[PDB]
């Protein structure tokens, strides 16, 4: 099990959850926040949520991973 904090992302309406250790780089484009996350198997994934959908508590975490 992971001992890190997980971040929930509203992927096109779906509720996804990525561990903070899997988050590679987050890039806020303004209203839309895009992020790259490492999944496994050599390949990774990506997503983009809105400022309104992303909770402040998690949004601040995204600020720390803002690369």
């Amino acid at each position: 099990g992971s001992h890190m904090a997980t971040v929930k992302f509203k992927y096109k309406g779906e509720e996804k959850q990525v561990d903070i250790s899997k988050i590679l780089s987050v890039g806020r484009y303004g209203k839309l926040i895009h992020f790259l996350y490492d999944l496994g198997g050599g390949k990774a994934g990506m997503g983009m949520v809105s400022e309104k959908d992303a909770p402040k508590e998690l949004l601040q975490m995204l600020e720390k991973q803002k690369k």
Partner: peptide, 10 residues
């Protein structure tokens, strides 16, 4: 297999 894509109209 893994590797999704978004598509939001900015």
């Amino acid at each position: 297999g893994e590797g999704e894509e978004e598509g939001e109209e900015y």
